[PDB]
Amino acid sequence: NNLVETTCKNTPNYQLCLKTLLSDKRSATGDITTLALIMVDAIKAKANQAAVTISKLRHSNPPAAWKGPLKNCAFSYKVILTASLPEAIEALTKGDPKFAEDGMVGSSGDAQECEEYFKSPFSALNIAVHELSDVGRAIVRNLL
C-alpha cells in the first residue's frame, strides 16, 4: 500500500514528509495516526538538537548581540519540548487529534519566532522544526 506516499502528497512538503516517515520503521504498517506520531517524534528530535545547541552557545559566553535572542529561544524550545509536543502525543494516543493540531501550530510558530529574534546560528534547525511542524499539522488534519 501507498499510505505514506499519499499522506505526504497532502502536506506542504512532499519530499521532506516522505523521507521523514520512511526513516521510522513504524511507517511500514502504520495508519495515519501512527504516521502523525512519527512526525511528532521527528520534530522532537530536531527541537532536542536546537535546545542543546542553544545551551552550548550560552555556555561559551556568547556575543552580547546574541544573549537576549538565545535566552528567548531557550524558552521557545522549553515550551515546544515540555508543553507542545507532549500535548500532541497525548492527543493522538487518546484519539482527540484536534489538540495535536494545536501543538504543531505552536511549534511551527515558536520555531519561526525564535529565528526572528536574531539568520540565527542554528537557522537550519529552526527551519527544520517549522517545516516538520507544518507537515505534521497537515497529516493531523486528515484525522479530523
Strand content: under 5%
CATH superfamily: Invertase/pectin methylesterase inhibitor family protein
For this structure, the CATH topology is Butyryl-CoA Dehydrogenase, subunit A, domain 3
Please give the count of helices.
6
- How many individual domains? 1
**Would you state the CATH class?**
Mainly Alpha
Helix content: over 70%
* Secondary structural class: mainly alpha
CATH architectural category: Up-down Bundle
Radius of gyration: 16 Å
Total strand count, please?
A: 0
Overall 3D shape: elongated
What is the terminal separation in angstroms?
22 Å
Describe the biggest sheet?
none
- The helix-strand sequence is HHHHHH
Domain Pectinesterase inhibitor: 1-139
Disulfide bonds: 8-17, 73-114
Keywords: Disulfide bond, Signal
Family: Belongs to the PMEI family.
Short summary of the structure?
The chain has 144 residues and is mainly alpha-helical.
